DNA sequence: ATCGACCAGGCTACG
DNA sequence: ATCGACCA
């Protein structure tokens, strides 16, 4: 496998979580593009070739390494496909393509939680730097849903349907659950640090990891994700 | 050189130039207001009539007298605009026809600008009135219902920054080394206003932050994007060049922004064609060195910094995401008198270099010169005293887009921009 | 926009 | 519209 050593006081942190171990060679097998093709797991269109990988491999295949430029093009999608088979409850898959999206209903108490539904949404991409360095970029959105409808409701229509008072408190609650503001709607001293702890916490829960690292399984080999934000150093 | 997923900080010391040869530090509103009131703005606007019209529906209102009071004193004491009188025009009813009558009545008396008060938050009425005034006279709008529970002292002195700029004045400019940076920076691109329609913009800036010329395309569909993007950019350079014939542009930078059709390869093609055509036409130097950058405030990245800086990175931090993409920290928690402020988490700006005609030896040196310049331009904002988490080359087009999209959505007057010189050289969008 | 802003000294506001 | 932010 590939081991990423020290991937990257005056230290900065970014919402990129490194895959320090991954298979240095993967099985890939290409077929000509056809216009009826529709995107899905274990295949990726590149130009007029359709590359199959992972569980899409069956009999006839080539083996390509991290030195080939094709490795990063495929491993960026093949990574997300693997992570999509490793979602832990109560998180559910919402969308999978070039981006992986997971959702959970927020069950912590908040006023007006009998009419307005709230759901963390982890937005997961893959970052590819150096030539052999990969990591998952995770962002966090919060979706506001009318519980009657399970359907998205904007800040405008909540005031219309339920009153301005309701909307105000729902906004403050979303900012509190984002850790952008206090539950009392006030700016505080550790907002950015608490936001990063929330990302790291929701990410470790979404993929059923109790610990700093966790290993996932691919047909080519095992990947290992370190659930600590990447460090950025000042240049020498 | 330039190691990746490391960070370098812009060398600090950037200052404003406020007039009487005086320089105040950035990120210090108290020093700037003290300096303005001792030395004036960088350029007091020269006015025709020395007369400002205030239009409202509140006859003999005390708050209107306090407002007119704060305006009159601060326009003289902070901005050094002397001997200004404020004539009041009362409109009988809060509808467009009634208000337009008083507007037109104010134009006929001879005024340099119109300060209009409206009762509530009426988006269609506001934009129908704003689009009308934009085509006629510098204007500044206010809401009566909100200035009731505001401290009118902060409300007015912040409000006057953009109004002085609309009258042609120059509150402050950046102090920049003349040996570094671009001769002009062109903020260009397009913004979707509907699901199907959009408009192109291009805005020419000096490296000191001042806007020299600006054009917008007519509202078109995405199939016409690249054509009007090229035409819009060429017309802004035409206007820039005819108003600056003595300026040989030898280094040029394009700041491309806006939610626009996803045609990156085609867009780069057309943009490089435009520079080559401008070279042929002698609008820029025949050997101009240029670069095309993509600036996006929307992206999934967050950067956490020093616990002594609200866990935020410092101003001017340049994180290298990959070989040609960077994250720039434009804004940070700022020292006030009794300590550091509390902030909601601040997102950096994504910067991607898409094209250049530099040699390999000067590449990394030039990249960090225009990255520094992007941070510098994020300190130019005449919309108020508080800083904007955007470079001016992206902030001002966004302000233009907000007016264009809403006027088109709610039925206001067409801007007719190419014909009017004032609209091309004044920040009517503030 | 859900909220409050900016000077040195010191009428702790205003400038 | 005081301004300052901010999914796609
Ligand atoms: Mg304005």
Automatic annotation (TrEMBL), chain A:
<protein>
    <submittedName>
        <fullName>Uncharacterized protein</fullName>
    </submittedName>
</protein>
């Amino acid at each position: 496998h590939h081991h990423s050593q020290d991937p990257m006081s005056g230290i900065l942190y970014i919402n990129i979580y490194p895959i320090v171990n991954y298979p240095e060679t993967i099985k890939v097998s290409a077929i000509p593009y056809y216009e009826e093709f529709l995107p899905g797991k274990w295949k990726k269109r590149i130009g007029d070739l359709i590359y199959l990988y992972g569980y899409g491999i069956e009999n006839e295949f080539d083996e390509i390494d991290n030195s080939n430029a094709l490795f990063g093009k495929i491993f960026r999608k093949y990574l997300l496909d693997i992570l999509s088979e490793n979602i832990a409850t109560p998180w559910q898959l919402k969308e999978l393509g070039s981006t992986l999206r997971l959702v959970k209903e927020i069950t912590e108490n908040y006023e007006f939680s009998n009419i307005i539904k709230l759901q963390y949404e982890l937005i997961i991409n893959v970052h590819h730097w150096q030539n052999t360095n990969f990591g998952i970029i995770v962002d966090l959105k919060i979706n506001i849903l009318d519980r009657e409808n399970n359907q998205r409701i904007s800040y405008t229509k909540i005031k219309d349907k339920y009153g301005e008072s309701v909307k105000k408190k729902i906004w403050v609650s979303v900012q509190a659950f984002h850790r952008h503001l206090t539950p009392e709607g006030k700016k505080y001293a550790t907002a950015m640090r608490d936001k990063f702890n929330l990302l790291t916490g929701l990410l470790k829960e979404a993929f059923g990891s109790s610990e700093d690292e966790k290993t996932f399984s691919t047909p080519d080999g095992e990947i290992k994700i370190v659930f600590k934000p990447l460090e950025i150093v000042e240049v020498s | 050189q330039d190691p990746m997923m490391e960070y370098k900080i812009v060398e600090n010391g950037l200052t404003y130039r406020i007039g009487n040869g005086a320089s105040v530090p950035i990120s210090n509103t108290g020093e700037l207001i003290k300096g303005l009131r001792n030395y004036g703005p960088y350029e007091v606007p020269s006015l025709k009539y020395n007369q400002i019209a205030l239009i409202h529906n509140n006859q003999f209102s005390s708050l209107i007298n306090q407002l007119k009071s704060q305006i009159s004193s601060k326009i003289d004491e902070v901005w050094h605009i002397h001997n200004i009188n404020i004539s009041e025009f009362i409109y009988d009813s809060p509808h467009f026809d009634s208000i337009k009558s008083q507007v037109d009545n104010a134009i006929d008396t001879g005024v340099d600008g119109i300060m209009l008060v409206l009762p509530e938050y009426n988006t269609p009425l506001y934009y129908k009135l704003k689009s009308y005034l934009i085509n006629s006279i510098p204007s500044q709008f206010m809401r009566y219902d909100i200035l009731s529970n505001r401290n009118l002292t902060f409300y007015v002195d912040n409000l006057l920054v953009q109004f002085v700029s609309k009258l042609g004045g120059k509150p402050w400019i950046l102090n920049v080394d003349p040996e570094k940076g671009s001769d002009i920076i062109i903020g260009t691109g397009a913004t979707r206003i509907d699901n199907v329609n959009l408009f192109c913009f291009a805005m020419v800036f000096k490296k000191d932050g001042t806007m020299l010329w600006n054009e917008i395309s007519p509202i078109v569909t995405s199939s016409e994007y690249l054509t009007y993007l090229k035409s819009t950019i060429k017309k802004v350079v035409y206007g820039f060049k005819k108003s600056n014939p003595d300026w040989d542009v030898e280094k040029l930078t394009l700041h491309v922004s806006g939610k626009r059709p996803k045609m990156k390869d085609g867009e780069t093609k057309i943009l490089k064609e435009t520079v080559e055509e401008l070279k042929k036409q002698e609008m820029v130097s025949r050997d101009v060195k240029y670069a095309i950058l993509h600036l996006n405030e929307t992206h999934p990245f967050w950067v956490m910094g020093d616990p002594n800086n609200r866990f935020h990175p410092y101003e001017g931090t340049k994180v290298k995401l990959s070989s040609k993409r960077y994250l720039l920290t434009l804004l940070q928690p700022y020292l006030k008198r009794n300590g550091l402020e509390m902030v909601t988490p601040i997102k950096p700006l994504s910067v991607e270099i898409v094209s250049d005609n530099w040699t390999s030896e000067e590449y990394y040196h030039n990249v960090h010169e225009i990255l520094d310049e992007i941070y510098y331009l994020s300190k130019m904002n005449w919309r108020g005293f508080r800083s904007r988490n955007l470079p001016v080359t992206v902030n001002y087009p966004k302000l233009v887009a907000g007016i264009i999209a809403n006027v088109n959505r709610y039925g206001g007057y067409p801007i007719n921009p190419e014909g009017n010189r004032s609209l091309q050289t004044n920040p009517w969008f503030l």
